[PDB]
Amino acid sequence: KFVAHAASFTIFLGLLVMNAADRFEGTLFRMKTSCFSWMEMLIISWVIGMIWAECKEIWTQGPKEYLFELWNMLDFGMLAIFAASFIARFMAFWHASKAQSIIDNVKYYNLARIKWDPSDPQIISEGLYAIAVVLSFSRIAYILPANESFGPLQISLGRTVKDIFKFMVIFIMVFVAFMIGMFNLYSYYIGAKQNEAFTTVEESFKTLFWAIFGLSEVKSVVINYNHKFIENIGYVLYGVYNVTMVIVLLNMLIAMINSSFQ
Amino acid sequence: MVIFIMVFVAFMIGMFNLYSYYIGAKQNEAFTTVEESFKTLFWAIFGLSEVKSVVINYNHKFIENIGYVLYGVYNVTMVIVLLNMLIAMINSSFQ
Ligand SMILES: CC(C)CCC[C@@H](C)[C@H]1CC[C@H]2[C@@H]3CC=C4C[C@@H](OC(=O)CCC(=O)O)CC[C@]4(C)[C@H]3CC[C@]12C
Ligand SMILES: CC(C)CCC[C@@H](C)[C@H]1CC[C@H]2[C@@H]3CC=C4C[C@@H](OC(=O)CCC(=O)O)CC[C@]4(C)[C@H]3CC[C@]12C
Ligand SMILES: CC(C)CCC[C@@H](C)[C@H]1CC[C@H]2[C@@H]3CC=C4C[C@@H](OC(=O)CCC(=O)O)CC[C@]4(C)[C@H]3CC[C@]12C
Ligand SMILES: CC(C)CCC[C@@H](C)[C@H]1CC[C@H]2[C@@H]3CC=C4C[C@@H](OC(=O)CCC(=O)O)CC[C@]4(C)[C@H]3CC[C@]12C
Ligand SMILES: CC(C)CCC[C@@H](C)[C@H]1CC[C@H]2[C@@H]3CC=C4C[C@@H](OC(=O)CCC(=O)O)CC[C@]4(C)[C@H]3CC[C@]12C
């Protein structure tokens, strides 16, 4: 049974890889794009089987017992997104089906990708399907514990994640502190800055998050105007943010080393 | 490296599926092909991959925001996996 279910999982991973095999090396009009290929048909069948397997699991285990395990929520989420992607794809298929059946209203579905609506179901389908594929690769956690060399690594990895989640409370508090502070400083200079950063709350969150991995430049503090007082305030707050973050990350690293030895 | 490979391949296929259609739309070729997606994610380990590899020129901000989340989740997952490797290797030296 373990080999049969592990072999089924490896086929589903193989289908996901080979689904985009046409564009591995490189890449009405919307009628062609909407249709499902034979690879897509198998993937839909696998997802339906996974949903039914989850339904039987929730039926016998009970809603309370099933919901208590947090990893089952992750496995339920990836199947919901996979169903979400395919229904959005079908909506784009049916809308193009009406347009082709007619042959103005039909004008939209002849357009190329550059002119698509931002909320096109085709766009939503591809965005969700990318998330589902990433999440579907996380079902290896049901097969890794069997192996005697990979099982200990998963157990050790789970302990690391739980410890990091403990320190995320302090990390969040410092993150939100500077995110609001930096946003209040640069909200007025929306068009003055060299690059949009700390201008909006979403943009301030994005800049400070990527600053953790050193992927945010220092020029996000610079302003084009002559107001060097506010720019110097930004340099201090951004500099204090990095010092505080490396201190918090250093404290987390040392405390996790202790936890391993204790 | 077994766990590291599994996480690497997970995002490599996921990011490629997201950005395969916007081959010419993106500011720089990254996550466009499987080879290009592998190259971008590998160099992201050493902080040598920019964040603008997620940005698209088109108005489709839904897919761009999906790319920001997946790329951000990838870095968090990688630093977690690298942190777990570092701590476990320190233990192995002392044991
Ligand atoms: C806690 C988990 C386990 C619940 C189940 C998974 C959800 C997180 C999934 C299931 C259905 C998904 C939704 C299905 C369809 C949509 C509509 C879609 O609408 C838009 O495109 C927003 C408009 C725009 O594009 O700007 C936004 C994503 C969303 C909410 C998806 C977000 C993720 C959802 C809620
Ligand atoms: C365990 C499983 C069975 C639960 C899965 C729940 C989904 C099947 C439901 C929940 C929310 C629904 C979604 C709510 C919003 C949308 C957005 C919609 O796209 C649009 O926003 C329309 C835009 C336009 O018409 O211009 C496509 C259908 C979809 C994904 C719906 C498809 C069906 C969804 C994903
Ligand atoms: C195909 C690409 C995109 C992903 C690369 C890894 C995958 C092929 C996945 C899918 C199936 C998985 C395999 C399914 C079968 C097995 C055998 C299994 O054997 C055991 O350790 C059990 C030993 C015992 O039975 O006592 C270990 C996990 C493993 C290697 C799994 C490892 C991860 C695999 C190879
Ligand atoms: C006791 C501590 C923990 C709380 C109080 C902190 C202050 C002592 C420090 C922290 C940040 C410092 C400020 C950061 C940078 C500036 C900008 C500076 O203005 C300029 O750079 C001049 C610009 C120009 O020349 O055009 C005036 C001092 C001030 C407010 C500093 C004054 C002293 C401050 C408020
Ligand atoms: C239970 C967990 C482990 C699995 C389910 C994960 C979801 C709860 C999260 C993960 C990534 C999230 C998505 C990442 C970012 C977006 C893009 C967002 O679309 C926009 O950014 C709007 C763009 C615009 O305004 O034009 C819609 C919500 C959504 C799908 C998020 C919905 C909630 C998601 C699916």
Question: Which token pair is B9?
Answer: 């391949």
- Is the distance from the beta carbon of residue A81 to the nearest atom of ligand 1 less than 6 Å? yes
- The answer for residues whose C-beta is within 8 angstroms of residue A60's C-beta and 6 or more apart is none
Q: Which of A215, A216, A250, A254 to mutate to test the interface with B (most CBs of B within 10 A)?
A: A215
Q: Which residues of B touch A160 (CB under 8 A)?
A: 80, 83-84, 87
Q: Can you tell me the distance from the alpha carbon of A17 to that of B18, in angstroms, rounded to the nearest whole number?
A: 13
Which residue's alpha carbon is at the smallest distance from atom 4 of ligand 1?
Answer: A77
Q: How far is residue A225 from each of residues A187, A189, A190, A222, measured CA to CA in Å?
A: 14, 9, 12, 9
Pairwise CA distance, residues A87 & A45, whole Å? 14
Query: Angle at the Cα of A23 (from A19 to A28), degrees rounded to 5?
Result: 85
Q: Which of A75, A89, A91 to mutate to test the pocket of ligand 2 (most atoms within 8 A of CB)?
A: A91
SS3 B56: strand
φ and ψ at A204, to 5 degrees? Answer: -65, -40
CA gap B41, B43 in Å, rounded: 6
Q: Is the dihedral of CA A13, A18, A23, A24 positive or negative?
A: positive
| DSSP string computed for A124-182 | HHHHHHHHHHHHHGGGGGGTGGGSTTTHHHHHHHHHHHHHHHHHHHHHHHHHHHHHHHH
Judge if the beta carbon of residue A13 lies within 6 A of ligand 3. Answer: yes
Q: Is the CB of A6 under 6 A from ligand 5?
A: no
Total residues belonging to chain A = 262
Beta-carbon separation of B75 and A160 below 8 A: no
Spell out the residues 6+ positions from residue A115 whose beta carbon is closer than 8 angstroms to its own.
none
Q: Where do runs of H (alpha helix) occur along B20-94?
A: 34-45, 61-94
